[PDB]
Unconditional design. Structure first.
Length: 371
């Protein structure tokens, strides 16, 4: 079985779906690895780096899509790639099918077998392929929040950690999942006074142990949310409700009572955002004004650090890539329930009940295609 990796084609998507380490492991097990020339340059992975690991480098995207039985990507296929979808191909990437009926229809019409990184789910409820991206997005959230607090960036002009005798920035992280924990940790590492809110007290209990009380924890009632947001210099919205679209926790009305020049970073913006006035924005123009405060809602944040996030993503996908490459989609999903929960399409059948509800489309029970 051939494994193919094309260059990512979306705007500012610098990541790549495999590293030389993954190539060497695939090549070692007797698989051809086809990589489009330049696919890894955005992540500081040179064409020579891939070749030396055993990859057969290919000049165009067309040949990768055409010759690969298992096609690894980072983002969903865009319109220019629908014509490349094939019936005898397994596509393994971030899909976000509920957000695109056109992508969903393209996969279905193609008959291709697709598996979504973000719904791969282990028995304990975790999402091991989304998690490294949530980790990166959290840590980024603190450092872009820090930057935009500078007066030269429209912020209040407050240094994250203060200096001796001067007040640190007051940072509120909403949500203590993978992303919020990581945002809280870096914001606290920078010297800020960090308060993390959640409705799951056990998550608060972990934070209280891990930083010995230094990261403050508050139960996330509507009252407590309003109070802390009013006093904050930087608000990080980290409520990434799995599958569900993010609730609007910070209304534009509450934004108008915020400190002037306060900064809001929404790292749930790949799910519509957890602020009311959040709209997906880009890396060139990152911020916009909401009642004399600054909103940051850049989507696909981990792509801005592709050297980090390409490795974080593909370290996590590699064992599923090996199972797929060695056994094919059906046996691999039979053996591994976590991989099965990512099954999205196969031969015109939509296999995700959540997507199928959200779009109004025939839902095929995943058991029918596997057993
Ligand atoms: C007033 C209402 C609007 C409210 O308080 N809402 C919330 N406030 C803080 N945290 C919340 C939350 N709803 C979920 N979460 C947590 O965010 C993490 C996401 O991974 C999860 O751990 C989850 O428990």
């Amino acid at each position: 079985m051939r494994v193919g990796i094309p260059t990512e084609t979306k705007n500012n998507e610098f990541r790549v779906a495999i590293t030389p380490a993954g190539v060497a492991e695939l090549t070692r097990r007797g698989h051809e690895v086809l990589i489009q020339a330049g696919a890894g340059e955005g992540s500081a992975i040179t064409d020579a780096d891939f070749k030396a690991a055993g990859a057969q480098l290919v000049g165009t995207a067309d040949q990768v899509w055409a010759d690969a039985d298992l096609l690894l990507k980072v983002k969903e296929p865009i319109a220019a790639e629908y014509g490349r979808l094939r019936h005898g191909q397994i596509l393994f990437t971030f899909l976000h099918l509920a957000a695109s009926r056109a992508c969903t229809d393209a996969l279905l019409d193609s008959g291709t077998t697709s598996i979504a990184y973000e719904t791969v789910q282990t028995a304990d409820g975790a999402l091991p392929l989304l998690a490294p991206m949530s980790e990166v997005a959290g840590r980024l959230a603190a450092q872009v929040g820090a930057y935009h607090l500078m007066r030269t960036q429209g912020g209040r002009g407050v240094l994250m950690g203060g200096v001796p005798g001067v007040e640190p920035a007051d940072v509120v992280v909403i949500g203590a999942g993978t992303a919020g924990y990581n945002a809280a940790r870096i914001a606290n590492g920078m010297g800020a006074t960090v308060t993390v809110l959640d409705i799951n007290i056990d998550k608060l209990r972990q934070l209280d142990a891990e930083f010995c009380g230094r990261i403050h924890t508050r139960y996330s009632s509507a009252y407590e949310l309003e109070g802390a947001v009013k006093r904050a210099d930087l608000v990080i919205g980290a409520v990434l409700v799995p599958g569900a679209k993010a609730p609007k926790l910070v209304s534009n009305s509450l934004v108008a009572h915020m400190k002037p020049g306060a900064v809001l970073v929404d790292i749930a913006i790949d799910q519509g955002g957890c602020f009311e006035g959040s709209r997906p924005t880009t890396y060139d123009h990152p911020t916009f004004a909401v009642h004399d405060t600054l909103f940051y809602c850049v989507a696909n944040m981990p792509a801005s650090v592709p050297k980090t996030s390409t490795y974080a993503l593909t370290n996590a996908t590699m064992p599923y890539v090996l199972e797929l490459a060695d056994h094919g989609w059906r046996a691999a999903c039979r053996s591994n329930p976590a991989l099965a929960k990512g099954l999205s399409t196969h031969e015109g059948a939509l296999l995700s009940e959540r997507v199928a509800t959200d779009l109004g489309v025939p839902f095929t029970e995943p058991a029918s295609v596997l057993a």
